[PDB]
Paper text:
Replication of the [name] genome is mediated by a viral RNA-dependent RNA polymerase (RdRp), named 3Dpol through a negative-sense RNA intermediate. RdRp uses [name] as a primer for both minus and plus strand RNA synthesis. The first step of the viral genome replication consists of the successive incorporation of two uridine-monophosphate residues to a highly conserved tyrosine residue (Tyr3) of [name]. This reaction, termed uridylylation, is also catalyzed by 3Dpol using as template a small stem-loop structure (cis-acting replication element (cre) or 3B-uridylylation site (bus)) that is located within the 5′-untranslated region.
Residue numbers in the entry: 1 to 476
C-alpha cells in the first residue's frame, strides 16, 4: 500500500506488550535460531536504531498503478476465474441472517465470542460479549445501529493494529520484523460474513485444485487428494512472494471485487461495497493514525479467501501477459493466501513471468532459494505448501504432510505459559509424518514430564483419517 498520511493523536491504542511465550525444556536441547517477536521498542535483542513503529509499516512502499490495457486484461482474468469459481460453487449467495452470521453454517465456523472487538469498542472497555449474544446469535443495539449504517453504505471505520506475539526467525526478530494483525470492528466482520458467508462456506466445502483454493483443507487427509493430482504433471512450481498482502494494488483489488462479487452471481449489491472498504484504510497504532491506499488489511484467517482469489487471478494474468492462448486448463494450481503450488504439462517459463507479476506490484522468487530463478522438471515431492512437503508413507502409499525438523524443533522450543501439554498433543499430530525415529527424537526432552502420544496411536489415527476402507482392509 501507499502511506498517504501519518498524523499523531490522543488515545494511545496500547499495542507494545510482553510475550506470553516462554522457552520449553526442548529449547536448551534444540537451540533453535528462533525466538518470540519483539513486542517493545525497548527489547534488548533488537538491532541498534530499529524502531518497531517504522519497521512494521515498511512493507507499504506504494500502490502500483496498472495501465488501461493491463487493467482490461486483469478484468478478463478476474471474470474467467469467477466463471470457474461460481460454476463449481453455484450462485446460492443470498445474505446470511444475523443468527447464521454469528453461529455460522455448515462449512463456516461461528464467530469467536471473546476475541478483540476493534475500534472504538476497545477504547470504551466494551468486550465482544457486551455487543453480541453469541449463545442466542443476536446483536445488541450498537452493532444493530452499525449494521443499518452499512445497509446505507455510510459506515466508516479504523483498523486496530496488534503485534503478532509468535515465534519468528532470530534474524527477523533482531530486524524488528514483528508481524501485525489488523483488527476491524466486530460489526464489519459480522456484515462481511452476512454478505459473502454462504460463498466462504462453499469455498471451504469445495477446497481443491478445481477452484485453486486450499482454504478450509485438512492437510492430514487432503495431502493424498492434492499429491495424486499434482504428481500427474511434467512441471511443478512453488512461488514465493515478498509481502503479497501489502502489495495488492487498488486497481487489482477493485477489479477482482467487481468481477467476483456481482449481483448476477447471487450476491447482495453491498458484498462488493463492504469488500471495497478494505482498499483505502486507516490504521491505529499507539498514538499514530496511518492512512494507506491499496493492500489487504494484515492477517491470515480473516483475509485468506480474498488473498487466495487474487493469487489465482495473478497466475492467469501473468501467463496471458507473456503467452497467447492461455486458458484456466493451461495449468493447475492450489493457493492458501500467498502460499501456492502451480503445475503444467507445458514448459512454462516462470523466470520470464517476473516482470508480469511486477506490473501487479508483486515480486516472485522460487520458494527453493535457488541462485538461479525458476526451473522445469520439479515435482510435487520437491515443493513446500503450508510449511509441509509431499512424501509418500511407505506403509500405505498415501501422501503425508511432512514438516521440516528445524521448524518442529522451533515450535516445540516455546509455548504460552500453562499450555505445554496441549501444545505437545497438537504438535505430535504434525511430527508423526516425520517418521518414528525423528518423532522419538523431537519429544525426548519432554519424556517423563508430559504425556507424549505413542507414534503408533497417531499413525493408526492418520491411516483411518485419510482412507477408512484401507484401515478396515488391513484386518482381512
Amino acid at each position: 500500500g501507499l502511506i498517504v498520511d501519518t498524523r499523531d493523536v490522543e488515545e494511545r491504542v496500547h499495542v507494545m506488550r510482553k510475550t506470553k511465550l516462554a522457552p520449553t525444556v526442548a529449547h536448551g536441547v534444540f537451540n533453535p535460531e528462533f525466538g518470540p517477536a519483539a513486542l517493545s521498542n525497548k527489547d534488548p535483542r533488537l538491532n541498534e536504531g530499529v524502531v518497531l513503529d517504522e519497521v512494521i509499516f515498511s512493507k507499504h512502499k506504494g500502490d502500483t498503478k496498472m495501465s488501461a490495457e493491463d487493467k482490461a486484461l486483469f478484468r478478463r482474468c478476474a471474470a474467467d476465474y469467477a466463471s470457474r469459481l461460481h460454476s463449481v460453487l453455484g450462485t446460492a449467495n443470498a445474505p446470511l441472517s444475523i443468527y447464521e452470521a454469528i453461529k455460522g453454517v455448515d462449512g463456516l465456523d461461528a464467530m469467536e465470542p471473546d476475541t478483540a472487538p476493534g475500534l472504538p469498542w476497545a477504547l470504551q472497555g466494551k468486550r465482544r460479549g457486551a455487543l453480541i449474544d453469541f449463545e442466542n446469535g443476536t446483536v445488541g443495539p450498537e452493532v444493530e445501529a452499525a449494521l443499518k449504517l452499512m445497509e446505507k453504505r455510510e459506515y466508516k471505520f479504523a483498523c486496530q493494529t496488534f503485534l503478532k506475539d509468535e515465534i519468528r526467525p532470530m534474524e527477523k526478530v533482531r530486524a524488528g520484523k514483528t508481524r501485525i494483525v489488523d483488527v476491524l470492528p466486530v460489526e464489519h466482520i459480522l456484515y462481511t460474513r452476512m454478505m459473502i458467508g454462504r460463498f466462504c462456506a462453499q469455498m471451504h466445502s469445495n477446497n481443491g485444485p478445481q477452484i485453486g483454493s486450499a482454504v478450509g483443507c485438512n492437510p492430514d487427509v487432503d495431502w493424498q487428494r492434492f499429491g495424486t493430482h499434482f504428481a500427474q504433471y511434467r512441471n511443478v512450481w512453488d512461488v514465493d512472494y515478498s509481502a503479497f498482502d501489502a502489495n495488492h494494488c487498488s486497481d487489482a483489488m477493485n477489479i477482482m471485487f467487481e468481477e467476483v462479487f456481482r449481483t448476477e452471481f447471487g450476491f447482495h449489491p453491498n458484498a462488493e461495497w463492504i469488500l471495497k472498504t478494505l482498499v483505502n484504510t486507516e490504521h491505529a497504532y499507539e498514538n499514530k493514525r496511518i492512512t494507506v491506499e491499496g493492500g489487504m488489511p494484515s492477517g491470515c484467517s480473516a483475509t485468506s479467501i480474498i488473498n487466495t482469489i487474487l493469487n489465482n487471478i495473478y497466475v492467469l494474468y501473468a501467463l496471458r501477459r507473456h503467452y497467447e492462448g492461455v486458458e484456466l486448463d493451461t495449468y493447475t494450481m492450489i493457493s492458501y493466501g500467498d502460499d501456492i503450488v502451480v503445475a503444467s504439462d507445458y514448459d512454462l517459463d516462470f523466470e520470464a513471468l517476473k516482470p508480469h507479476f511486477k506490473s501487479l506490484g508483486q515480486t516472485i522468487t522460487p520458494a527453493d532459494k535457488s541462485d538461479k530463478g525458476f526451473v522445469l522438471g520439479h515435482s510435487i515431492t520437491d515443493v513446500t505448501f503450508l510449511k509441509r512437503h509431499f512424501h509418500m508413507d511407505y506403509g500405505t502409499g498415501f501422501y503425508k504432510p511432512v514438516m521440516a525438523s528445524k521448524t518442529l524443533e522451533a515450535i516445540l522450543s516455546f509455548a504460552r505459559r500453562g499450555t505445554i501439554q496441549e501444545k505437545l498433543i497438537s504438535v505430535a499430530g504434525l511430527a508423526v509424518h516425520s517418521g518414528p525415529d525423528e518423532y522419538r527424537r523431537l519429544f525426548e526432552p519432554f519424556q517423563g514430564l508430559f504425556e507424549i502420544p505413542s507414534y503408533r496411536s497417531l499413525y493408526l489415527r492418520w491411516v483411518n483419517a485419510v482412507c477408512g476402507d484401507a484401515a478396515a482392509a488391513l484386518e482381512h
